Amino acid sequence: VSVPALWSEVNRYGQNGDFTRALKTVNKILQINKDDVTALHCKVVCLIQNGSFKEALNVINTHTKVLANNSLSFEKAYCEYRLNRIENALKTIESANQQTDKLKELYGQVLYRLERYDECLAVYRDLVRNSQDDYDEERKTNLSAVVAAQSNWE
């Protein structure tokens, strides 16, 4: 009912992976506070989680001024990447106000798609060295896939 109570529901649904219900709730918050940056960010996340990449990208691109330096560069680049706009995704990553681990993760994937395998390997070696998650075996698999792609050429 109240905005903080709506946020409580956003958090509960998101934590449980119910992005559909979180999105419905976030949209109610946006009806009350139309340019709430956190709500716009959550909406974009819900849309990506439900495979609505065009809609997510549209949210970002129609709120450019409001999202300045919370530009959602990771999410924007992610959507472009999933929409096979790889050059756009690269540009978005490179022009991001603040670099982050998630941006670097996506950057590795973008370089792989661009067949820039040497720089890709450097990015993945770095990610494996400095990781703080449970995805290192998956990253090592990515590393091996990159080397396999290179081997095709020699």
Binding site: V3, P4, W7, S8, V10, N11, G14, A22, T38, H41, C42, V45, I48, Q49, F74, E75, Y78, Y81, D101, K102, E105, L106, Q109, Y112, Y135, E138, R139, T141, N142, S144, A145, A148
Partner: peptide
Amino acid sequence: PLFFDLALNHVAFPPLEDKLAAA
């Protein structure tokens, strides 16, 4: 042989405690 989209795993809400608190 496999290549994983690990970036998808990082698609997550920002911290919400300020919004929960009505800060």
